[PDB]
Protein backbone atom coordinates (compact mmCIF):
# COMPACT_ATOMS: atom_id res chain seq x y z
CA UNK A 1 0.00 0.00 0.00
CA UNK A 2 0.93 3.69 -0.27
CA UNK A 3 -0.92 5.67 2.41
CA UNK A 4 0.63 3.75 5.31
CA UNK A 5 4.11 4.59 4.03
CA UNK A 6 3.34 8.32 3.90
CA UNK A 7 1.85 8.21 7.39
CA UNK A 8 4.91 6.50 8.84
CA UNK A 9 7.18 8.98 7.02
CA UNK A 10 5.32 11.94 8.55
CA UNK A 11 5.35 10.39 12.03
CA UNK A 12 9.08 9.66 11.86
CA UNK A 13 9.87 13.20 10.71
CA UNK A 14 7.89 14.71 13.57
CA UNK A 15 9.58 12.37 16.06
CA UNK A 16 13.02 13.34 14.76
CA UNK A 17 12.26 17.05 15.14
CA UNK A 18 10.97 16.59 18.70
CA UNK A 19 13.98 14.52 19.78
CA UNK A 20 16.42 17.04 18.32
CA UNK A 21 14.71 19.87 20.20
CA UNK A 22 14.79 17.92 23.47
CA UNK A 23 18.49 17.11 23.03
CA UNK A 24 19.34 20.77 22.45
CA UNK A 25 17.36 21.83 25.53
CA UNK A 26 19.16 19.26 27.70
CA UNK A 27 22.53 20.41 26.38
CA UNK A 28 21.55 23.96 27.34
CA UNK A 29 20.56 22.88 30.87
CA UNK A 30 23.89 21.07 31.38
CA UNK A 31 25.80 24.36 31.63
CA UNK A 32 23.48 25.84 34.27
CA UNK A 33 23.67 22.64 36.31
CA UNK A 34 27.48 22.69 36.15
CA UNK A 35 27.52 26.34 37.21
CA UNK A 36 25.21 25.65 40.16
CA UNK A 37 26.95 22.54 41.50
CA UNK A 38 30.39 24.11 42.03
CA UNK A 39 29.22 26.77 44.53
CA UNK A 40 29.29 24.73 47.77
CA UNK A 41 33.05 24.06 47.97
CA UNK A 42 34.16 26.92 50.30
CA UNK A 43 31.56 26.23 53.00
CA UNK A 44 32.35 22.51 52.95
CA UNK A 45 36.10 23.13 53.20
CA UNK A 46 35.71 25.61 56.05
CA UNK A 47 33.30 23.41 58.01
CA UNK A 48 35.66 20.45 57.59
CA UNK A 49 38.58 22.55 58.84
CA UNK A 50 36.51 23.75 61.81
CA UNK A 51 35.43 20.22 62.74
CA UNK A 52 38.95 18.80 62.43
CA UNK A 53 40.50 21.59 64.50
CA UNK A 54 37.82 21.35 67.20
CA UNK A 55 38.11 17.55 67.41
CA UNK A 56 41.92 17.60 67.41
CA UNK A 57 42.14 18.47 71.10
CA UNK A 58 38.67 17.14 71.99
CA UNK A 59 37.64 13.84 73.54
CA UNK A 60 36.67 11.09 71.09
CA UNK A 61 33.26 9.95 72.31
CA UNK A 62 29.92 10.29 70.53
CA UNK A 63 27.02 8.00 69.50
CA UNK A 64 27.88 8.75 65.87
CA UNK A 65 31.49 7.88 66.77
CA UNK A 66 30.78 4.76 68.84
CA UNK A 67 29.27 1.60 67.35
CA UNK A 68 26.44 -0.70 68.34
CA UNK A 69 27.88 -3.83 69.91
CA UNK A 70 25.61 -6.15 67.91
CA UNK A 71 24.61 -6.44 64.21
CA UNK A 72 20.87 -5.87 64.51
CA UNK A 73 19.98 -4.23 61.18
CA UNK A 74 21.26 -1.74 58.62
CA UNK A 75 19.43 1.08 56.88
CA UNK A 76 19.98 2.27 53.33
CA UNK A 77 18.94 5.18 51.10
CA UNK A 78 18.51 5.08 47.32
CA UNK A 79 18.35 8.12 45.05
CA UNK A 80 16.69 8.29 41.64
CA UNK A 81 15.23 10.73 39.11
CA UNK A 82 11.80 12.25 38.52
CA UNK A 83 11.52 11.77 34.74
CA UNK A 84 11.97 9.03 32.17
CA UNK A 85 14.02 8.78 28.98
CA UNK A 86 17.20 8.80 31.09
CA UNK A 87 18.77 5.65 29.63
CA UNK A 88 20.43 3.08 31.90
CA UNK A 89 20.74 5.52 34.81
CA UNK A 90 17.91 3.92 36.78
CA UNK A 91 19.09 0.44 35.79
CA UNK A 92 22.61 1.11 37.05
CA UNK A 93 21.35 2.61 40.32
CA UNK A 94 19.02 -0.34 40.94
CA UNK A 95 21.73 -2.88 40.10
CA UNK A 96 24.12 -1.23 42.55
CA UNK A 97 21.38 -1.27 45.20
CA UNK A 98 20.71 -4.97 44.55
CA UNK A 99 24.39 -5.88 44.80
CA UNK A 100 24.64 -3.94 48.07
CA UNK A 101 21.61 -5.86 49.35
CA UNK A 102 23.30 -9.12 48.36
CA UNK A 103 26.47 -8.05 50.17
CA UNK A 104 24.60 -7.20 53.37
CA UNK A 105 22.59 -10.44 53.17
CA UNK A 106 25.71 -12.43 54.09
CA UNK A 107 25.52 -11.06 57.65
CA UNK A 108 21.88 -12.07 58.17
CA UNK A 109 20.75 -8.51 58.94
CA UNK A 110 17.29 -7.52 57.74
CA UNK A 111 17.64 -4.14 55.97
CA UNK A 112 15.35 -1.11 55.89
CA UNK A 113 15.26 1.36 53.00
CA UNK A 114 14.27 4.92 52.17
CA UNK A 115 13.50 5.95 48.58
CA UNK A 116 13.54 9.31 46.79
CA UNK A 117 12.06 9.74 43.33
CA UNK A 118 8.94 8.49 41.59
CA UNK A 119 10.54 5.93 39.25
CA UNK A 120 12.40 3.94 41.90
CA UNK A 121 9.43 4.25 44.27
CA UNK A 122 7.17 2.62 41.69
CA UNK A 123 9.76 -0.01 40.78
CA UNK A 124 10.08 -1.11 44.41
CA UNK A 125 6.31 -0.79 44.86
CA UNK A 126 5.76 -3.47 42.21
CA UNK A 127 8.30 -5.61 44.07
CA UNK A 128 7.50 -6.92 47.55
CA UNK A 129 9.39 -4.73 50.02
CA UNK A 130 8.72 -2.17 52.72
CA UNK A 131 9.14 1.58 52.18
CA UNK A 132 9.32 3.70 55.33
CA UNK A 133 9.00 7.06 53.57
CA UNK A 134 9.08 8.55 50.08
CA UNK A 135 10.22 12.00 48.93
CA UNK A 136 9.35 13.21 45.43
CA UNK A 137 9.04 16.38 43.38
CA UNK A 138 12.37 18.15 43.92
CA UNK A 139 15.02 16.02 42.18
CA UNK A 140 15.26 18.42 39.23
CA UNK A 141 15.96 21.44 41.47
CA UNK A 142 17.12 20.77 45.05
CA UNK A 143 17.50 23.06 48.04
CA UNK A 144 19.04 23.00 51.51
CA UNK A 145 15.81 22.55 53.48
CA UNK A 146 15.00 19.10 52.08
CA UNK A 147 18.54 17.86 52.72
CA UNK A 148 18.42 19.24 56.26
CA UNK A 149 15.13 17.50 57.05
CA UNK A 150 16.33 14.21 55.53
CA UNK A 151 19.50 14.37 57.62
CA UNK A 152 17.50 15.16 60.75
CA UNK A 153 15.19 12.20 60.19
CA UNK A 154 18.08 9.81 59.52
CA UNK A 155 20.05 11.00 62.56
CA UNK A 156 16.97 10.62 64.76
CA UNK A 157 16.46 7.09 63.43
CA UNK A 158 20.09 6.26 64.23
CA UNK A 159 19.75 7.77 67.72
CA UNK A 160 16.65 5.65 68.36
CA UNK A 161 18.85 2.53 68.71
CA UNK A 162 20.48 3.20 72.07
CA UNK A 163 19.21 0.07 73.87
CA UNK A 164 17.61 -1.97 71.08
CA UNK A 165 18.26 -5.58 72.13
CA UNK A 166 16.59 -8.44 70.29
CA UNK A 167 13.03 -7.32 69.63
CA UNK A 168 13.03 -5.11 72.74
CA UNK A 169 13.13 -1.41 71.88
CA UNK A 170 14.09 -0.62 75.48
CA UNK A 171 13.55 2.87 76.84
CA UNK A 172 13.63 4.19 73.26
CA UNK A 173 10.13 2.85 72.61
CA UNK A 174 10.73 2.15 68.91
CA UNK A 175 12.99 -0.35 67.17
CA UNK A 176 15.80 1.59 65.51
CA UNK A 177 18.55 1.15 62.96
CA UNK A 178 22.24 0.42 63.50
CA UNK A 179 23.80 1.38 60.14
CA UNK A 180 23.14 3.64 57.16
CA UNK A 181 24.26 3.68 53.53
CA UNK A 182 24.19 6.14 50.64
CA UNK A 183 23.82 5.16 46.98
CA UNK A 184 24.14 7.73 44.19
CA UNK A 185 26.15 8.61 41.08
CA UNK A 186 29.10 10.98 40.78
CA UNK A 187 30.35 13.17 37.91
CA UNK A 188 33.68 11.82 36.70
CA UNK A 189 33.53 13.46 33.26
CA UNK A 190 31.11 14.59 30.56
CA UNK A 191 30.90 10.95 29.42
CA UNK A 192 32.11 9.09 32.55
CA UNK A 193 29.39 8.49 35.15
CA UNK A 194 29.63 5.50 37.50
CA UNK A 195 27.31 4.60 40.37
CA UNK A 196 28.90 4.79 43.83
CA UNK A 197 27.68 3.40 47.16
CA UNK A 198 29.38 4.53 50.36
CA UNK A 199 28.96 4.15 54.12
CA UNK A 200 28.84 7.31 56.22
CA UNK A 201 26.75 6.67 59.36
CA UNK A 202 29.42 5.98 62.04
CA UNK A 203 32.37 8.35 61.97
CA UNK A 204 35.90 7.01 62.35
CA UNK A 205 39.28 8.54 63.14
CA UNK A 206 42.62 8.12 61.37
CA UNK A 207 45.61 9.83 62.97
CA UNK A 208 47.76 11.60 60.37
CA UNK A 209 50.64 11.68 62.85
CA UNK A 210 53.09 14.41 63.77
CA UNK A 211 43.04 27.74 69.83
CA UNK A 212 40.60 28.65 72.59
CA UNK A 213 37.15 27.10 73.07
CA UNK A 214 35.01 29.78 74.71
CA UNK A 215 31.92 27.52 75.10
CA UNK A 216 31.85 23.88 76.18
CA UNK A 217 33.93 21.91 73.63
CA UNK A 218 31.65 18.88 73.95
CA UNK A 219 28.59 21.04 73.31
CA UNK A 220 30.19 22.57 70.21
CA UNK A 221 31.19 19.13 68.92
CA UNK A 222 27.69 17.69 69.42
CA UNK A 223 26.09 20.73 67.78
CA UNK A 224 28.55 20.70 64.87
CA UNK A 225 28.27 17.06 63.72
CA UNK A 226 24.64 17.29 62.45
CA UNK A 227 25.63 20.30 60.34
CA UNK A 228 28.37 18.21 58.73
CA UNK A 229 25.91 15.39 58.01
CA UNK A 230 23.42 17.83 56.49
CA UNK A 231 26.12 19.42 54.33
CA UNK A 232 27.13 16.03 52.93
CA UNK A 233 23.49 15.15 52.22
CA UNK A 234 23.05 18.48 50.42
CA UNK A 235 26.24 17.94 48.41
CA UNK A 236 24.87 14.63 47.11
CA UNK A 237 21.88 16.17 45.31
CA UNK A 238 23.71 18.51 42.92
CA UNK A 239 25.99 15.74 41.67
CA UNK A 240 22.97 13.46 41.26
CA UNK A 241 21.13 16.01 39.11
CA UNK A 242 24.18 16.80 36.96
CA UNK A 243 24.85 13.11 36.31
CA UNK A 244 21.19 12.56 35.44
CA UNK A 245 21.16 15.33 32.82
CA UNK A 246 24.50 14.23 31.34
CA UNK A 247 23.15 10.70 30.97
CA UNK A 248 19.93 12.09 29.46
CA UNK A 249 21.57 13.95 26.56
CA UNK A 250 23.14 10.95 24.79
CA UNK A 251 19.83 9.07 24.69
CA UNK A 252 18.21 11.80 22.60
CA UNK A 253 21.28 12.02 20.36
CA UNK A 254 21.20 8.29 19.61
CA UNK A 255 17.41 8.38 19.20
CA UNK A 256 17.63 10.93 16.38
CA UNK A 257 20.54 9.10 14.76
CA UNK A 258 18.56 5.85 14.77
CA UNK A 259 15.38 7.58 13.58
CA UNK A 260 16.94 8.83 10.33
CA UNK A 261 17.55 5.36 8.87
CA UNK A 262 13.87 4.41 9.16
CA UNK A 263 13.03 7.37 6.93
CA UNK A 264 15.67 6.25 4.43
CA UNK A 265 14.46 2.64 4.24
CA UNK A 266 10.78 3.59 3.99
CA UNK A 267 11.56 6.02 1.17
CA UNK A 268 13.33 3.26 -0.76
CA UNK A 269 10.42 0.87 -0.25
CA UNK A 270 7.86 3.46 -1.38
CA UNK A 271 9.78 4.23 -4.57
CA UNK A 272 10.08 0.53 -5.39
CA UNK A 273 6.36 -0.03 -4.87
CA UNK A 274 5.42 2.95 -7.06
CA UNK A 275 7.61 1.72 -9.92
CA UNK A 276 6.17 -1.80 -9.66
CA UNK A 277 2.59 -0.49 -9.70
CA UNK A 278 3.05 1.74 -12.74
CA UNK A 279 4.85 -0.94 -14.76
CA UNK A 280 2.16 -3.50 -13.91
CA UNK A 281 -0.59 -1.11 -14.99
CA UNK A 282 1.07 -0.31 -18.32
CA UNK A 283 1.76 -4.00 -19.02
CA UNK A 284 -1.87 -4.89 -18.34
CA UNK A 285 -3.29 -2.08 -20.48
CA UNK A 286 -1.01 -2.81 -23.45
CA UNK A 287 -1.80 -6.52 -23.23
CA UNK A 288 -5.50 -5.75 -23.21
CA UNK A 289 -5.25 -3.34 -26.14
CA UNK A 290 -3.15 -5.60 -28.38
CA UNK A 291 -5.45 -8.61 -27.92
CA UNK A 292 -8.05 -6.99 -30.21
Amino acid sequence: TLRELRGRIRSAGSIKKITKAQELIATSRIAKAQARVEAARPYAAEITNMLTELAGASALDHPLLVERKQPKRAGVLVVSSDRGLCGAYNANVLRRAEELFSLLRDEGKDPVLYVVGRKALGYFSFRQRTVVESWTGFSERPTYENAREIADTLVNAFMAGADDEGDDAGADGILGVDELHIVFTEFRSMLSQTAVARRAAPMEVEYVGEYSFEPDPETLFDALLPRYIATRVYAALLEAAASESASRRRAMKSATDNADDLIKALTLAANRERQAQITQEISEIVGGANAL
Binding site: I15, G84, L85, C86, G87, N258, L262
Partner: peptide
Protein backbone atom coordinates in the same frame (compact mmCIF):
# COMPACT_ATOMS: atom_id res chain seq x y z
CA UNK B 1 11.46 -0.95 20.95
CA UNK B 2 13.18 -0.32 17.60
CA UNK B 3 13.74 3.42 18.18
CA UNK B 4 13.84 4.35 21.87
CA UNK B 5 14.74 0.96 23.33
CA UNK B 6 13.95 -0.82 26.60
CA UNK B 7 14.13 2.33 28.76
CA UNK B 8 10.65 3.63 27.93
CA UNK B 9 8.96 0.29 28.63
CA UNK B 10 7.92 -0.83 32.10
CA UNK B 11 9.55 -3.74 33.91
CA UNK B 12 6.31 -5.72 33.55
Amino acid sequence: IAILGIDELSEE
